[PDB]
Amino acid sequence: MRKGEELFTGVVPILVELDGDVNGHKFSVRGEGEGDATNGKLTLKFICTTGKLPVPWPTLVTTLVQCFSRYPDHMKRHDFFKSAMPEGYVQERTISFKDDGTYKTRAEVKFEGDTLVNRIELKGIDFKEDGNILGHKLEYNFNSCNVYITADKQKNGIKANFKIRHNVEDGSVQLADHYQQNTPIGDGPVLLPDNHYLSTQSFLSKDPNEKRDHMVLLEFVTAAGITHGM
Amino acid sequence: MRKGEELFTGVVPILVELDGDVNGHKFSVRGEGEGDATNGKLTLKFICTTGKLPVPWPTLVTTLVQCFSRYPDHMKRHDFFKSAMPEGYVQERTISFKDDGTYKTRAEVKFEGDTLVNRIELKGIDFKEDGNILGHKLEYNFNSCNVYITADKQKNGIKANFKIRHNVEDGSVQLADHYQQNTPIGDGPVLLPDNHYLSTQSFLSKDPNEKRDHMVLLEFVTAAGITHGM
């Protein structure tokens, strides 16, 4: 219906480009695949194009396109992410690993022709040489509870903070606290939502034929927490 | 693909019939609407046909069709609920309200012609006259974390136990512990899954034009927790 909305009615090609620096360990990640917003479905394959990924793949999942969330019909007015398209939005995080380092991400999510591009810069500091992150001690999997989206009245966008619990091999848990702010890139009307949340299921596999350090990622996202409308 | 699966590829009409007895308070509920398994989407309207519902609508949500879960393609072998169709399955629960009473449900979920029918008997006992349930002190809303499905090797079906946290008006929480066992009605092959879970978003509203005690229910369900396949 809305012009932003209209860009997402089919299957859309995704490109993700991440340049990272964690404690001076430089790397790049490239992802390719597609988003089906009607089904809230993401299929992507990520490659560490620089060799060995110096952090665990799961710590990068949230950083590596919430415009592909399935908003139920009655909640469509609360979908900031698609309203910002095609011009797109800046997404910034601080991710705080408990008793370990901090990631700071600046990404732009926008249309470049036919393709939805998530282009990221990641800077990690004060990582332990043999913590769960630099010492790769995290299980190859991922889950989250509800992620709460709130309006940023001030800067005309959205904010979110949420806790990711990563399984450690010794059977312990590594907390990664996410604070997120998103601002539109363009000056065109956007939708500022009421409080609601996104529910994400995540599936991380391996292509048995891929030799490069990679992640196969399948995701389902559904927005909830608002009944008004209906 | 599978013959059970094939019954759910479109929009299917649902009828739900509940006869209840809580502490001698007899009531019936009738629900009508549709399930779209491809989208994991349920739309139903429930009527208390006997007058005032003597328990809160949210305590009945889990009792009032997990065959409408969206199983991702790679997880289709782990979908017991549709394998049992058309003949269907018996679903039994004990729901234990913390410091209050207990529900016992026996339902049959099966095809009757074109329609998926959930026909239930509910028996509630040892309810407090002025607890959160008989004294209607629960907020008109509903959420759950993951519901874990496990095979019942013994009786050729599935089992689940899960905790529902109902919001109370004083700002407290009422726990309802669910133990679930499902057995196929027929003797035909069924699929016994590996451990996985269902994630449900729930939206409870009112038809502003309905005078009878009712619940409008919209639900999204997605199965996860298995990456093998893909």
Numbering used by the authors:
A (entry chain A), B (entry chain A): 1 to 64, 68 to 233
Q: How is this structure described in the published paper?
A:
Here, we have linked one of the most common protein–protein interaction events, homodimerisation, to an essential trace metal, copper, through engineering green fluorescent protein. By incorporating a cysteine at residue 148 together with a mutation that stabilises the dimer interface, we engineered sfGFP to switch to a highly fluorescent “on” dimeric state. Structures of the monomeric and dimeric GFP-diS2 suggest that charge switching is through peptide bond flipping and the formation of a buried organised water network around the chromophore that spans the interface region.
In mGFP-diS2, H148C has a major impact on the local organisation of the structure that directly impacts the interactions with the CRO. The backbone of residues 147–149 is twisted compared to sfGFPWT resulting in a register shift of S147 and C148. The change in position of C148 results in the loss of the H-bond to the CRO and becomes solvent exposed, therefore making it amenable to forming a disulphide bond. The new potential H-bond between CRO and S147 does not however appear to compensate for the H148C mutation in terms of promoting the phenolate chromophore form. Indeed, compared to wt sfGFP, the water network is less extensive around the phenol group for mGFP-diS2, with the sole water present potentially undergoing dynamic exchange with the bulk solvent via the channel shown in Fig. 3b. Thus, the cumulation of these structural changes is likely to promote CRO–OH on the introduction of the H148C mutation. The V206F mutation does not have any significant impact on the local structure of sfGFP with both backbone and side-chain configurations of the mutated residue and surrounding residues being similar.
